[model samples]
Target: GVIMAGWFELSKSSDNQFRFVLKAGNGETILTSELYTSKTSAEKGIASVRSNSPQEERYEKKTASNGKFYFNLKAANHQIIGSSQMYATAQSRETGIASVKANGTSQTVKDNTGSN
Candidate 1:
């Protein structure tokens, strides 16, 4: 079988906020997390995505005013934990959603926060 996998990159911002980005098997940026006050909090956000991404009900598909499409991945609390890039069409948006579902369970996290 083909090895379809994805991974996460955890990093810190200049203001010292922690965030994570999910990348698909082809290395495309799939979803991005909200800024967290601490690294542990960011990790918890990632865990929430992993647990929530599989449920179709947690994904909210939406349209931009320009007619482009995108999606938001929500947690059990109804907070958006991650979001997708804009797509040209609804089908493309669905593909992005599927990518998140496919790779959301990835156990690998690349710590790019630059410190132990």
Candidate 2:
């Protein structure tokens, strides 16, 4: 278990240019990226992953204590787009949330995928 902080920030002059920082359990920078997006949406997008995932996205976790869930977002059937994770005991997994974002829009998708 770990606590992460830090917001992805964008330069006021460069609307679509932004960077993010993810802090790890040991105070290490576990993730960092200069991602591209022109949307006025970010929180909602990530939140969807915590909700509203598809049926095929469902997976079982026999044990909550050490269970880990991994997700890969894709556009091409042959390519995996993005990856994220959640512990079985974490709030998101239990709440059935999966985030999905569309191309060329500022809106985001956040909802409980619920159980299949």
Candidate 3:
């Protein structure tokens, strides 16, 4: 599959700061001072873990199997500080996005729930 949308970092500043030039399938730009804040926005997320093991995925609780949908993907535990809202489809959502075309240059990066 073609990943029509994603980000790349050009330079990494301190633990919370870096330089990034975001790029999309269309074009790219340089966000000279990108700052990834260290805020835990994961609280806005809601997911379910298996009663027995580690099969956690988000969905509307009390839902039948058919109605079950993973609001978030199961990822390994790591240095993740926040959760960005997942787009239904990157192609449609990233259309006309401000930094979709910028290449990763300088960005203030932060740790998320699952970052090494």
Candidate 4:
């Protein structure tokens, strides 16, 4: 099977915060980022994902309260910048990681802020 490329989209929330969603090649959102003060900050977070996604150690995988699996993309400081959607299986979680690694670095920045 041939997997597709994913994309990351940046949008500003009403609270004047910037955030992003990593969408799978099929246009399904696989991961999301924390709220940032500015778009620049959000971009930095995305860059962090690009640099770190290739390292399995950079991801902190967890099982939610319901026992669903998920993962977080952490910065050098161990702070979580982005989180993955809950997956039913560990294999799917790993697939999400691969998606980020392949598509995150040169991902286009889409602005839905409605300001500019």
Candidate 5:
């Protein structure tokens, strides 16, 4: 098996807000973030994700009205930090959860803020 590590990619949104996505080892986007006001704030959000990602109780699983499965990662304070991509099945959503747990502690971050 090929060993690839997951990482976080930080980028700026079109509205000039900062956000990030956690990419699995296979390059699949497992989680996305809400827009933040500044790069510093966004990085703090990333740090929050890293700190809280490993806690099973922090993941809030849900089913969309369309029957799609998804989840939200919350901080200790119950604030949502990130959301997962929609999955066709509950199994797939669980897989996404496992991926986040497996890679949450990853130290690698790819910054695409395009600012100095």
Candidate 6:
């Protein structure tokens, strides 16, 4: 089977804050970025995801209160810029992580708002 990977979307999260979501080609949200005051910062965060996603050590895997598993993609500073959807198992979660690493750098951007 063919799996098309990362594509990103930028959108506003607050009155003056913005966020970015990394989606698979099939449109599943693999991860999301933290809020940024400027689109420029969010764009930088996207770049960070591209570079950081490849390193397995950068992915912070976690379990939710209900025991569902998830993961966060961290920048070099250890800040979470992207996060994953809840998965039924660690293996599924790692598949999503692998997708991010494979596709993060070449992701095409979709701007939800008129501005960048």
Cα RMSD of predicted structure 5: 2.8
Tell me the tens digit of each residue's lDDT in model 2 across 31-114.
222343532333433333223334334323233345664344333222222233444554543332222221111112222122
Report the lDDT tens digits of candidate 5 across residue range 1-116. Answer: 65556988888877778888899878889998888878787777778888877776788899999999999997655656788998999999998888887777775779888754
Which ten residues in a row are the worst by lDDT in model 5? 74-83
TM-score against native, each model = 0.89, 0.27, 0.23, 0.86, 0.88, 0.84
List the lowest-lDDT window of 10 residues for candidate 2: 99-108
Regions of model 2 farther than 4 Å from truth = 1-66, 94-97, 101-116
Q: Please give the range of 10 consecutive residues that has the lowest summed lDDT in model 4.
A: 107-116
Q: Write the per-residue lDDT of candidate 4 for residues 17-100, one digit (tens) a residue.
A: 889888876788877899888788787798898788677778888989887899988997666778889999989988877877
- lDDT (Cα, 0-100) at 52 in candidate 3: 9
Q: How far is 50's C-alpha from truth in model 5 (Å)?
A: 1.3
Residue 88 in model 6: lDDT: 88
lDDT of each: 0.85, 0.31, 0.28, 0.80, 0.82, 0.80
Give the Cα error of residue 110 in candidate 3, in Å: 15
Model 6 lDDT tens row, 1-116:
65556678888864757888888767877888887888888888888888886677888889998878888887767777887888988898888778787778665888885553
On lDDT, the candidate that comes out on top is 1
Better-scoring candidate (lDDT), 1 or 5: 1
Question: Model 6 scores what on Cα lDDT?
Answer: 0.80
Name the 10 consecutive residues with the lowest summed lDDT in model 1: 74-83
Cα lDDT for residue 108, candidate 1: 79
Please give the range of 10 consecutive residues that has the lowest summed lDDT in model 3: 44-53
TM-score of candidate 5 to 2 decimals: 0.88
How many residue pairs in model 6 have overlapping backbones?
1
